[PDB]
Amino acid sequence: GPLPDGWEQAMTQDGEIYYINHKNKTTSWLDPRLDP
């Protein structure tokens, strides 16, 4: 869905999507806003 805008979902060729958080400088695979 629409992310908090700190992180962007990029697709790695291994077949996994990862969020690069430019604000917290941290990686997390899946959409955290879909958590609720």
């Binding site: 990029a10 790695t12 060729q13 291994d14 996994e16 990862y18 969020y19 690069i20 958080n21 430019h22 400088k25 941290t26 990686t27 997390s28 695979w29």
Partner: peptide, 12 residues
């Protein structure tokens, strides 16, 4: 797996 370092994008 732990997500790759945000420093750069994995090409694999």
């Amino acid at each position: 797996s732990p997500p790759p370092p945000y420093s750069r994008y994995p090409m694999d």
